[PDB]
Design a protein around this ligand. Structure first.
Ligand SMILES: [Ca+2]
Lengths: 56, 222
Protein backbone atom coordinates (compact mmCIF):
# COMPACT_ATOMS: atom_id res chain seq x y z
CA UNK A 1 0.00 0.00 0.00
CA UNK A 2 1.66 3.15 -1.32
CA UNK A 3 -0.73 5.20 0.82
CA UNK A 4 1.21 4.02 3.86
CA UNK A 5 4.61 5.13 2.53
CA UNK A 6 6.29 8.19 4.05
CA UNK A 7 6.50 11.26 1.73
CA UNK A 8 9.41 11.35 -0.71
CA UNK A 9 11.03 14.70 -1.56
CA UNK A 10 13.35 13.21 -4.17
CA UNK A 11 16.75 14.44 -5.51
CA UNK A 12 15.62 17.60 -7.31
CA UNK A 13 16.04 21.01 -5.67
CA UNK A 14 12.62 22.65 -6.05
CA UNK A 15 10.28 23.59 -3.20
CA UNK A 16 6.90 22.41 -4.54
CA UNK A 17 4.11 21.89 -2.00
CA UNK A 18 2.28 18.59 -2.47
CA UNK A 19 0.02 16.33 -0.39
CA UNK A 20 0.56 12.87 1.05
CA UNK A 21 -1.71 10.61 3.02
CA UNK A 22 -0.58 10.39 6.64
CA UNK A 23 -2.10 7.12 7.84
CA UNK A 24 -1.11 7.90 11.45
CA UNK A 25 -3.10 11.16 11.52
CA UNK A 26 -5.80 9.83 9.24
CA UNK A 27 -5.52 12.79 6.88
CA UNK A 28 -3.65 14.25 3.94
CA UNK A 29 -0.85 16.64 4.82
CA UNK A 30 1.50 18.88 2.92
CA UNK A 31 5.21 18.22 2.34
CA UNK A 32 7.96 19.66 0.16
CA UNK A 33 8.50 17.82 -3.13
CA UNK A 34 11.76 18.45 -4.98
CA UNK A 35 10.34 18.30 -8.48
CA UNK A 36 11.30 14.88 -9.74
CA UNK A 37 10.99 11.14 -9.16
CA UNK A 38 7.69 11.32 -7.31
CA UNK A 39 6.43 8.18 -5.59
CA UNK A 40 2.70 7.45 -5.56
CA UNK A 41 1.82 9.02 -2.19
CA UNK A 42 2.20 12.50 -3.73
CA UNK A 43 -0.86 14.53 -4.80
CA UNK A 44 -1.49 17.98 -6.18
CA UNK A 45 -4.50 18.61 -3.93
CA UNK A 46 -6.07 17.35 -0.73
CA UNK A 47 -9.13 16.20 -2.71
CA UNK A 48 -7.08 13.92 -4.96
CA UNK A 49 -5.27 12.60 -1.91
CA UNK A 50 -8.49 11.82 0.00
CA UNK A 51 -10.08 10.18 -3.05
CA UNK A 52 -7.11 7.88 -3.67
CA UNK A 53 -5.92 7.18 -0.11
CA UNK A 54 -8.62 8.29 2.30
CA UNK A 55 -9.29 5.65 4.93
CA UNK A 56 -6.13 3.59 4.30
CA UNK B 1 21.59 27.90 -0.15
CA UNK B 2 23.33 26.21 2.82
CA UNK B 3 26.44 27.89 4.18
CA UNK B 4 26.21 31.03 2.09
CA UNK B 5 25.82 34.73 2.76
CA UNK B 6 23.25 37.48 2.13
CA UNK B 7 23.89 38.81 -1.38
CA UNK B 8 22.63 42.31 -0.71
CA UNK B 9 19.58 43.83 -2.41
CA UNK B 10 19.60 43.54 -6.21
CA UNK B 11 23.29 42.63 -6.42
CA UNK B 12 22.26 39.60 -8.55
CA UNK B 13 19.99 41.50 -11.05
CA UNK B 14 19.47 38.44 -13.26
CA UNK B 15 18.04 36.25 -10.49
CA UNK B 16 14.30 35.60 -10.75
CA UNK B 17 11.76 33.84 -8.56
CA UNK B 18 9.19 31.52 -10.12
CA UNK B 19 5.93 31.93 -8.19
CA UNK B 20 2.79 29.76 -8.18
CA UNK B 21 1.23 31.22 -5.06
CA UNK B 22 4.63 30.90 -3.34
CA UNK B 23 8.27 30.70 -4.45
CA UNK B 24 9.00 27.20 -5.79
CA UNK B 25 12.04 27.65 -8.10
CA UNK B 26 14.57 30.22 -9.25
CA UNK B 27 15.62 31.20 -12.77
CA UNK B 28 17.88 33.55 -14.76
CA UNK B 29 16.89 36.42 -17.03
CA UNK B 30 18.76 36.04 -20.35
CA UNK B 31 17.00 38.89 -22.19
CA UNK B 32 14.07 41.26 -21.59
CA UNK B 33 11.48 38.61 -22.39
CA UNK B 34 13.14 35.26 -21.66
CA UNK B 35 14.09 33.31 -18.54
CA UNK B 36 16.01 30.03 -18.29
CA UNK B 37 15.31 27.56 -15.45
CA UNK B 38 15.16 23.83 -14.87
CA UNK B 39 12.82 21.49 -16.70
CA UNK B 40 11.62 19.86 -13.47
CA UNK B 41 10.35 23.34 -12.43
CA UNK B 42 7.73 23.22 -15.20
CA UNK B 43 4.33 24.20 -13.81
CA UNK B 44 1.19 25.87 -15.13
CA UNK B 45 0.29 29.35 -13.94
CA UNK B 46 3.84 30.53 -13.38
CA UNK B 47 4.35 34.16 -12.38
CA UNK B 48 7.93 35.40 -12.76
CA UNK B 49 9.15 37.88 -10.16
CA UNK B 50 12.03 40.18 -11.03
CA UNK B 51 13.88 42.75 -8.96
CA UNK B 52 13.28 40.70 -5.80
CA UNK B 53 15.32 40.68 -2.63
CA UNK B 54 12.90 39.98 0.22
CA UNK B 55 10.39 37.66 -1.48
CA UNK B 56 7.89 38.17 1.33
CA UNK B 57 7.44 41.95 1.27
CA UNK B 58 6.84 44.37 -1.59
CA UNK B 59 9.90 46.62 -1.55
CA UNK B 60 9.25 48.66 -4.69
CA UNK B 61 11.80 47.39 -7.24
CA UNK B 62 9.69 44.36 -8.27
CA UNK B 63 8.16 43.45 -11.59
CA UNK B 64 5.74 40.51 -11.52
CA UNK B 65 5.11 39.20 -15.06
CA UNK B 66 3.22 36.06 -16.02
CA UNK B 67 4.74 33.48 -18.31
CA UNK B 68 3.18 33.23 -21.77
CA UNK B 69 5.09 30.11 -22.85
CA UNK B 70 7.19 27.45 -21.07
CA UNK B 71 9.48 25.38 -23.32
CA UNK B 72 11.00 22.25 -21.72
CA UNK B 73 13.93 20.75 -23.62
CA UNK B 74 12.54 18.17 -26.13
CA UNK B 75 14.97 15.58 -24.80
CA UNK B 76 14.43 16.21 -21.08
CA UNK B 77 14.28 12.86 -19.27
CA UNK B 78 12.37 12.98 -16.00
CA UNK B 79 13.92 9.73 -14.83
CA UNK B 80 17.63 10.40 -15.54
CA UNK B 81 17.33 14.19 -15.24
CA UNK B 82 19.32 14.57 -18.46
CA UNK B 83 18.63 17.82 -20.38
CA UNK B 84 17.10 19.51 -17.31
CA UNK B 85 16.61 22.92 -18.92
CA UNK B 86 13.57 25.05 -19.76
CA UNK B 87 12.90 28.43 -21.33
CA UNK B 88 10.12 30.70 -20.11
CA UNK B 89 8.81 33.51 -22.30
CA UNK B 90 7.43 36.49 -20.36
CA UNK B 91 3.98 37.75 -21.29
CA UNK B 92 5.49 41.24 -21.60
CA UNK B 93 9.09 42.42 -21.68
CA UNK B 94 10.71 43.39 -18.41
CA UNK B 95 12.11 46.91 -17.97
CA UNK B 96 15.87 46.42 -17.63
CA UNK B 97 20.56 48.18 -12.64
CA UNK B 98 18.27 46.21 -10.30
CA UNK B 99 16.99 44.02 -13.17
CA UNK B 100 19.42 42.98 -15.91
CA UNK B 101 20.08 39.91 -18.05
CA UNK B 102 23.03 37.51 -17.77
CA UNK B 103 25.25 36.52 -20.73
CA UNK B 104 25.30 33.02 -22.17
CA UNK B 105 28.70 31.26 -22.26
CA UNK B 106 30.96 31.23 -25.34
CA UNK B 107 32.81 28.19 -23.95
CA UNK B 108 32.49 25.62 -21.15
CA UNK B 109 34.09 26.36 -17.80
CA UNK B 110 36.89 24.25 -16.41
CA UNK B 111 37.26 22.43 -13.10
CA UNK B 112 38.42 24.80 -10.43
CA UNK B 113 36.54 27.77 -11.83
CA UNK B 114 34.95 29.76 -8.98
CA UNK B 115 31.24 30.53 -9.53
CA UNK B 116 28.40 32.35 -7.77
CA UNK B 117 25.26 30.36 -6.95
CA UNK B 118 22.18 32.19 -5.64
CA UNK B 119 18.66 31.43 -4.46
CA UNK B 120 15.94 31.61 -1.79
CA UNK B 121 16.11 27.91 -0.99
CA UNK B 122 16.53 26.12 2.35
CA UNK B 123 19.52 27.31 4.39
CA UNK B 124 19.76 24.18 6.61
CA UNK B 125 21.35 20.86 5.67
CA UNK B 126 19.62 19.05 8.52
CA UNK B 127 16.41 21.00 9.01
CA UNK B 128 14.25 23.66 7.37
CA UNK B 129 14.72 27.40 7.21
CA UNK B 130 13.70 29.41 4.15
CA UNK B 131 15.14 32.93 3.90
CA UNK B 132 13.31 36.20 3.14
CA UNK B 133 16.32 37.63 1.32
CA UNK B 134 18.47 36.25 -1.48
CA UNK B 135 21.44 34.12 -0.41
CA UNK B 136 24.72 33.69 -2.29
CA UNK B 137 27.49 31.10 -2.40
CA UNK B 138 30.87 30.94 -4.13
CA UNK B 139 31.70 27.35 -5.09
CA UNK B 140 34.19 25.90 -7.58
CA UNK B 141 33.34 23.69 -10.52
CA UNK B 142 34.56 20.11 -9.85
CA UNK B 143 36.21 17.75 -12.32
CA UNK B 144 34.08 15.31 -14.25
CA UNK B 145 35.98 12.42 -12.63
CA UNK B 146 35.13 13.36 -9.05
CA UNK B 147 31.54 14.15 -10.03
CA UNK B 148 31.18 10.68 -11.51
CA UNK B 149 32.85 9.18 -8.43
CA UNK B 150 30.27 10.93 -6.18
CA UNK B 151 27.30 9.80 -8.33
CA UNK B 152 28.16 6.52 -10.11
CA UNK B 153 26.34 6.00 -13.38
CA UNK B 154 24.24 9.13 -12.94
CA UNK B 155 26.33 11.90 -14.43
CA UNK B 156 25.82 12.61 -18.15
CA UNK B 157 27.83 14.93 -20.37
CA UNK B 158 25.18 17.59 -19.73
CA UNK B 159 25.80 17.77 -15.98
CA UNK B 160 28.57 19.16 -13.78
CA UNK B 161 29.25 19.09 -10.05
CA UNK B 162 30.15 22.15 -8.05
CA UNK B 163 30.76 22.64 -4.37
CA UNK B 164 32.86 21.16 -1.59
CA UNK B 165 33.49 17.50 -0.84
CA UNK B 166 33.66 18.41 2.84
CA UNK B 167 30.00 19.49 2.71
CA UNK B 168 28.48 22.44 4.58
CA UNK B 169 28.13 24.72 1.53
CA UNK B 170 25.60 23.81 -1.19
CA UNK B 171 22.30 24.61 -2.93
CA UNK B 172 19.11 23.10 -1.48
CA UNK B 173 15.23 22.90 -1.94
CA UNK B 174 14.00 26.15 -3.33
CA UNK B 175 17.15 26.79 -5.38
CA UNK B 176 16.33 24.66 -8.45
CA UNK B 177 16.45 26.56 -11.75
CA UNK B 178 18.66 29.26 -10.27
CA UNK B 179 21.97 30.51 -11.74
CA UNK B 180 25.58 29.28 -11.47
CA UNK B 181 27.53 32.26 -12.84
CA UNK B 182 31.25 32.15 -13.55
CA UNK B 183 33.26 35.01 -15.04
CA UNK B 184 30.00 36.83 -15.79
CA UNK B 185 28.53 34.05 -17.91
CA UNK B 186 25.72 31.68 -17.05
CA UNK B 187 27.35 28.24 -16.84
CA UNK B 188 24.89 26.18 -14.85
CA UNK B 189 21.34 25.72 -13.62
CA UNK B 190 20.70 24.32 -10.09
CA UNK B 191 19.32 20.85 -10.69
CA UNK B 192 19.75 17.97 -8.22
CA UNK B 193 21.89 16.27 -5.56
CA UNK B 194 21.76 13.81 -2.66
CA UNK B 195 20.47 15.91 0.21
CA UNK B 196 22.04 19.29 0.82
CA UNK B 197 25.57 20.09 1.93
CA UNK B 198 26.38 16.43 2.70
CA UNK B 199 30.05 15.36 2.70
CA UNK B 200 31.10 13.76 -0.61
CA UNK B 201 27.80 14.70 -2.25
CA UNK B 202 28.23 18.02 -4.11
CA UNK B 203 25.33 19.59 -6.00
CA UNK B 204 24.67 18.67 -9.65
CA UNK B 205 24.02 21.39 -12.25
CA UNK B 206 22.82 21.49 -15.88
CA UNK B 207 25.79 22.33 -18.15
CA UNK B 208 24.49 25.43 -19.97
CA UNK B 209 27.43 25.71 -22.42
CA UNK B 210 26.03 22.62 -24.19
CA UNK B 211 22.68 24.31 -24.93
CA UNK B 212 23.66 27.75 -26.17
CA UNK B 213 22.74 27.17 -29.82
CA UNK B 214 19.44 25.50 -28.80
CA UNK B 215 18.67 28.43 -26.50
CA UNK B 216 19.44 31.12 -29.12
CA UNK B 217 17.42 29.47 -31.89
CA UNK B 218 14.50 28.52 -29.62
CA UNK B 219 14.22 32.07 -28.30
CA UNK B 220 14.28 33.45 -31.85
CA UNK B 221 11.54 31.23 -33.20
CA UNK B 222 9.02 31.74 -30.38
CA1 LIG C 1 9.89 41.76 -2.56
Amino acid sequence: DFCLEPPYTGPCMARIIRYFYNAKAGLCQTFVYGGCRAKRNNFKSAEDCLRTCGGA
Amino acid sequence: IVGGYTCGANTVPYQVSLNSGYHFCGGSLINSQWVVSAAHCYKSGIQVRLGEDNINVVEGNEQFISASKSIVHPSYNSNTLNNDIMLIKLKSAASLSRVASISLPTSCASAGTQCLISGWGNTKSSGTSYPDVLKCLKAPILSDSSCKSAYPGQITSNMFCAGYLEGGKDSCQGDSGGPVVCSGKLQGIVSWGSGCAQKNKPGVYTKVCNYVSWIKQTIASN
